[model samples]
Target: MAVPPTYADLGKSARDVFTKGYGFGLIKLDLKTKSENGLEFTSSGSANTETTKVTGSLETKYRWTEYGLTFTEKWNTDNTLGTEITVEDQLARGLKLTFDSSFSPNTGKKNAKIKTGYKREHINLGCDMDFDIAGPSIRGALVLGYEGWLAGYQMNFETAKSRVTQSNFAVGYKTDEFQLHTNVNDGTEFGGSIYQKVNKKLETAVNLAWTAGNSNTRFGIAAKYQIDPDACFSAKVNNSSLIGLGYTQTLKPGIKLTLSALLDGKNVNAGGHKLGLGLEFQALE
Candidate 1:
């Protein structure tokens, strides 16, 4: 078979040989239990007790891609309930475009005074294109995207922090197997980061960034070790100033499971650093 015909050859096939089809199913579960017992000092010394909380979540994913288009849908329950839908399709031979919309409800607040709804929503638009400017030895990809907040969402405890919008752009390049990538973002933070692939088995990445309105600067380092096609180890250190380890395991077909401790600086303590796990199922045809 030959590649699908492109504009270069009006009636000839120029489709790519690497183009293929894919599909998968996955599931992940998390459980957390915390308890506290203390004594209150008073004239007679009194005992105090606190209640315990139990939270559980289950999620499912479905995806299908044919020709050069993809569709995805996901549902989950962890804090409140939510749904995400995304559509991505290709234009020309090397361009990829995606549109995403999400809705989550009943998310609590950081403090009691910051009463907020569980419903947090956002819309995302992304586009990326990769072409062989100089053949397989050198190639580049440019990604640009932005996110818009829904009417019901708030940025934080203060309504003043809530903005109806935000955005960022990233550029990356690869020289055969060795690659370089960087991203600059400024919706809530104005910062940029870079990565360099040292070899086939190892890579190092670093970042220096500051929030949109803050004078404080953040710095971090990340390392990745690929054990094989279906397995890998990762670690990173960010501004909150902590280190962590992560593992990725692939099951039969397109199923994959990942678990990490001490997540990226962005979402380190939102859910805790002990366990961070995710399951993703994807395919290409």
Candidate 2:
């Protein structure tokens, strides 16, 4: 089969493939543990010879009458740290309100966000806003739709410039055998994706993206197959001429392992490939 020429046709070059591949195709390590008192801790990090990034977080939750609260602390390798707090309250008539705030330790900056939504039957309406203490940059989103369909619009404004810096529109549809999603950002980039289940064990998806600034289009395809209850295989290829392969296996009750490889179609040399391996463990409370 031949791919037809369209607005989303992929460019043939692969100059920008390495950076994209390295981000998601590298080795990762993660550790997660929870205490009996509803406190959870997680640590994860990824590293190469040039750069290393590590993140750790602790979270706890509390509940009140028709309301809930969660507090979290997140930190990274470079001493970048933040604390986040979230609160939620339930109201009558299927309405709910959520509030979230975060503080940056390094910059001494704080941001607050709130969202309220109403749900009834198969329809839902949601709106959210984000702002900082300095109040120069703000963003918000409004969503309205049904169970299987949704449409949302978002905007980011710079108070200093008195202009909208960025805006986007997103829509999605879902069905038993297929799902679709697409969004356009700032009228500069448009992208869409579709996923289809071919059978009980097989699923496939394709993504198309175009950017107005570069006048370039890109496409990619991905597929997954379940070998059995404990093993799975996945693969993806993008228009940038990059390919990725992944396999996951369950070794035991609490431990699982993953292996991945990324190949550059442009380089094609044996030494020009990247490999990744990861193991995950879960503790039963």
Candidate 3:
């Protein structure tokens, strides 16, 4: 038995494989630098034509080895500044604590949160709470794993409303070659996924979800293939005739480039098509 993931991403494995690398009409750049003195810096910028917004973020992180603490400061394009502190094994083994706070210079609004997590050989549990005094939001999650089977539950409570805001339940089974997941979210939406590792260089995934209120079902399938050590390819298709293709190449030792496109299968000659490009550069490995 192994500790299972908390409810936040109980079924995210297949979703990540099927949908992570596809974006339309966006350009992104990321740069990261790390120093020998336990300090790191990261900067990222992205421009998306779909929303017509240019967003950027900068982050600085430092690690305290003696105290088992890590701290991060971040500023984003929306004029929001945030800080987070995490302590690992300070109180006990398998326990972690984090505090996060954010403020917006433009809006003058401040927010804060506290989170605590614990993991054991067969179970994982976590809790988080908003810093608001009157109308705080609290959430708790628990997961249990036995052999290859896993089950998890998550719930959120709104203090002011005196009600459960949301609740989700998930179950999954995993093996070396494949995994299956099914979840019910908020008691109204149902979702499932299947992930398969065909070989060392090939992987495939499928996802399906439906909402009970709207009777709308969505489905997609995707596959990724590693062409070589420096290049990889991906393709995905949905039930609505939307097709996505992506290619990633390592252009240099520390620079990688990715190209992605989205096309309509039913209207191949139509004008509605999108392309995305991304680049990443790293130093001080």
Candidate 4:
């Protein structure tokens, strides 16, 4: 399993955009355009010339009732193609049902899995299954929450064992400006995040956690500042003494730029300096 993002990750430009511009040390270019026929197209590529990559996606909606379909493709370094179809409906007042499926053409994996979920009032329920092969995996979750308190339980089962192989339980509390979450998985791993918004322009977050078998707990904090509607900055530091800074600017109506940097306070001479930049363009609908 991968460790959660530390405060440094939260402050990176990729994550902060405006809060702090030091993104993940990789440059990316993104383009988005909406067609007259209502098709939305998005494309992104890495700035690394040695390991070039490009991915694109197209999506469209129908009847404006939250129904949509999306197709995505990737090329270079890692080549793959996929499509997803989504269908949703209002089952009743305050109740909704959603269904999603995806297919991978290169791997000949079609409808590899299907997911269905529903939400009503204080409850959320979901299930997923692989229907095309034996030993298919299945998963389900039930969540219940009210106001500031919430809890959820989930499990994953395999057809071969006819029993749950993994499970997790979580609970949290949230308000307009503050949020907290915690979860324990299969009695082995635990983690959570806490966030606070001091005002319209300033926000902060902290996360501390440990897996069941880990010897050390991870800790980090991040802060974001919105200088204005068109610019923002962010910064973060973690227990490892790593720091990051990021900044973003809206160049114009459909263009934006970002820059970010990361530093290792513990070993400055290790050449542990990292920088990243990104440019984005969005066509008006």
Highest-scoring model, lDDT: 3
| Whole-structure CA lDDT of model 3 | 0.77
Candidate 2 per-residue C-alpha lDDT over 1-285 given as tens digits, one digit per residue, 9 for 90 to 100: 111211111111111221244544455666666555545566566555346543333333333333354555566554545455545444455455666555455665445666655444444445555665566566665554555675556677777568888876666776788766666668787777676788887778777768897879878787778878899887778887888877878888767687877787878585487676666666645
> How much does candidate 2 score in TM-score?
0.75
TM-score on alpha carbons, each prediction: 0.44, 0.75, 0.86, 0.75
Q: In candidate 1, which residue ranges exceed 4 Å CA deviation?
A: 1-64, 78-101, 104-164, 171-182, 228-231, 249-259, 263-273, 276-285
- Give me the overall lDDT of model 1: 0.37
Candidate 4 global lDDT? 0.60
Tens digits of per-residue lDDT for model 1, 1-285: 122211111101111111111111112333221112111111111111224322333334333444333333333323444333333333333333443323244543211111111111222122222112232111122222223111111111112333322243333333443333333343654444455576677776666556667677776667778978898877666656666666777776656667656543455468444444555453321
lDDT of 3 by residue, 198-267 (tens): 8787888888778787889978888888979899998888888888877888987889887888787768
- Every candidate's lDDT: 0.37, 0.60, 0.77, 0.60
In model 2, what is the error at residue 95, expressed in angstroms? 4.7
Clashes of 4: 20
| Residue 102 displacement (Å), model 4 | 5.7
Residue 91 displacement in candidate 1 (angstroms) = 9.6
Name the lDDT value of residue 129 in candidate 1: 21
Candidate 4 error regions (>4 Å): 1-25, 35-38, 50-77, 91-111, 160-166, 184-188
How accurate locally is residue 162 in candidate 2, as Cα lDDT from 0 to 100? Answer: 82
Candidate 2: pairs in clash: none
